[model samples]
Target: SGPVVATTKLVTFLQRVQHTALRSYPKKQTPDPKSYIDLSLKRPYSLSTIESAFDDLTSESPVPVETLEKFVKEYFDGAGEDLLHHEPVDFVSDPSGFLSNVENEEVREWAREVHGLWRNLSCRVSDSVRESADRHTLLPLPEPVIIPGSRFREVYYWDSYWVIKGLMTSQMFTTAKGLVTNLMSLVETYGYALNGARAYYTNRSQPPLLSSMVYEIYNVTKDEELVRKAIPLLLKEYEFWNSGKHKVVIRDANGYDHVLSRYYAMWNKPRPESSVFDEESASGFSTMLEKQRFHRDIATAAESGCAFSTRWMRDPPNFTTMATTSVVPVDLNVFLLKMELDIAFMMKVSGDQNGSDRFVKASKAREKAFQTVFWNEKAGQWLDYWLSSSESETWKAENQNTNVFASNFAPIWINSINSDENLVKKVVTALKNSGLIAPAGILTSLTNSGQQWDSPNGWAPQQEMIVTGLGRSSVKEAKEMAEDIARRWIKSNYLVYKKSGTIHEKLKVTELGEYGGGGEYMPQTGFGWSNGVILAFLEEYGWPSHLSI
Candidate 1:
């Protein structure tokens, strides 16, 4: 019911190769363990032969480096050969009149360079992959994809939103449309988009931003064809999120039932992609049941996209205390609310009045439910609620996560309180006092748990989501704050880019111009979301010539 590929004979052999490589291959600073699993079995090689040969060499114990190297060279393609390079037809040296709002020539030049990275990150499935799917772990996605660069060599779910954002701003509508189409293909195949375009990613999805991607593209091109193609699939995706294990029924203090969603991966086994890390992370659990729960929690956290964050941890800096499935995250609900609005808009565009009306009512009910379950009057912002147990759906007021997170203010970004100016004012005051704003941008959380999604590491998507919401506000104070944060974020990004000559996946916002570190792998570059967020910011608040970067 989860991942068809994860159980395939081909995947079993690749995972064996992965574990062997992780153990026998000389430890190195770069190239994550997942890279080995990402490799395709070469055409001449038979899966049965590879499995038998690997079994003989014995994955039970580390084989000699010489033998392991020999086996890999004989059987498997290079780690990233599954996706071939693609030249987007829409790419240009400079789209005419791009970034015209930026008065600073230097800023505009850097933006153009950022736009050029789309070419660097663009790719299509290799002919070998499409011809022989079982021999490879990579999923076959239709249309060209914009990968998240470095170790992330394939299309990612939530990262595509920001990538599409940049693509639209760059006026590369063709490439942008291709990205959305590729994700939609995943939806059609799996009933939901995956965390990334890989066999291992089929068990879970990242943040649900597919609708946001379509909305952004539609706004830019007014592409009705895209809306029509997307509405039914989006409805399917919505059902997937709102039903089954993902859906939570919370009866608030007022004794009314409300529906919300949480990130809950179907599999409790070790994540196929990061199996090595998962096994080790679960090693300390007292029982197999505990270990299985931990495994599910780890996978669920990955689905949050802010993987390895304190926001998902029950005990600060205690990686083993991760109970992501137990918490109803604020950011996740905010994203779903946005998705509902986007789908309704798309429905109207497609002339499906009935569907539009249904989604509209769904959104209003969700809004009321959202306000009831998440809004924390005393905290001056929304809070993530924790269930007493995964078995129970009742809400306990005392269970709200009071810790300040970038996510708590996410509703502000969506203008969730648009009708109530007083609530908006109160929310703004809380955000200003939340101690999230730093020297460069908003900190991911107050605690520096040494996790990538925690303090000291501010990611591009969080910055964009928080800032864009504020920027769109009718409140003058909110708008000004949004601009100020935008200025700091843009300046920090430019300053770091100038020094590194590249974009980073995450930044050390607390340290101004420094790039971020710490997480499952080495800090990545050619980052899809970072580049997109920068371009989006430039579009929103253009750099003035006099502004010091």
Candidate 2:
């Protein structure tokens, strides 16, 4: 139906043909050839050549297994030439200022010692490449910024939102602004930022967060020039989401057309860089279509930044079940709505009265569409609306099967629908009763799946979202709920890091002995977003900004 959906089908065919040979490589399947940063070599190596080579090694007259592997390697080697990159940034600041009494002396030194991680995690990249040996990244950045720790080596789209928030809390204004500038350059260059500056990410992108980043920096800098330069780019990013495969006009029950967005990646084949992992993970799917659907859904799931989470699954607690693109995600639409409001604010600030009014109109339209299409009147919350069929002329909203999950709380955290106090209170009541606000904070979801985004594991961004959203609300109960979530999340991270000196990508909200599960890799450290979120929360809750976590 789209780029990812279409290409994934094509690649699935190729994978089946060269199945025996492709299985030998470290990652098994190669990424889309077009993903190679070297676009001129789009068809650099023919699949036919590789298949013919495979055919040469027939079982009837077998070549040695070792010899067959070598033959396959010769042709497929450097297949994703220079698609990923990694290099240290020119500027890295070792944070001398650190957090103290971060939940008391129990963890004060741990806070101070780990403050060095942000600088340690910061790095730069070369603008071009054609070789594929470097296991961790993509093109260079326009400015110095922090990348998430562990296996995530490049700048991510939504992860930067929390990274920016944390940078703002640390008062690393320059560094924080650089993150936006780098993303802005991507918006200017790619029409949208690639998932993580990696060549394999060109066909997919994470959540739309550029406007939020710009707004975050602008709030502190009051730098009109930053706003002035960013307005057009913000508009461009808005257009990017509302433009091609990402945009869709779904009709509500009342026959009203609501313009909302969905996560639709341009490439559906097994992501080249992570092809080995994805292929092995989809072992449960026996057929090509089943396997390809899993591939497209996973790629689409990445676009939502809720990779492998139950929140996006069609059937909760079922990892193999995926229907991410069919539903218009609450967070993605919330993000799009935020982008429009942010642009209008930026427009008004820049004195473009007419432009501001246009966005203002756009905002109202989105708001109306959001409340109608996304609202769960029976559940009294926001849930993603699913369109049952792609061929249907209108979007139907008959199903409201699952709103018990945690992501349904996105609008509350975004504070986008804060106008109705009773509604806010209803959401707060829902939270307290939702069973997701575990001792550690908001659990990513109620059902525990082996996936990292699933239950018992609370991510940095989701925690920050709920907390920040509550704090921004006018309701007193919402404010109190915000503080409660913040305290618990801080306590959990503090206790874990205090003992192990391990800053993680996600936290265990259910119990102390066990950490969160799910995803191809184990929990990671040198954690950029976790470090940033902890600092931001501490600073906000009177933990002393100077001695931040």
Residue runs of model 1 more than 4 Å from their true location after superposition: 1-6, 26-31, 59-61, 416-419
Error of 2 at 253 (Å): 3.4
* Model 2 C-alpha lDDT per residue in residues 77-136, reported as the tens digit of each score: 333232233333422343444443344553454445555566666665533332422322
TM-scores, one per candidate: 0.96, 0.81
Across 303-422, the per-residue lDDT of candidate 1 in tens digits comes to 899888888889878999998988888888888888889988888887889888887888888789768889989888889988887644677788899999888888876655654577
Model 1, position 134: C-alpha lDDT score = 85
What is the lDDT of every predicted structure here?
0.84, 0.69
Structure candidate 1, residue pairs in collision? 413-469
- Predicted candidate 1, C-alpha RMSD: 1.9
Candidate of highest lDDT: 1
* Candidate 1 to truth, TM: 0.96
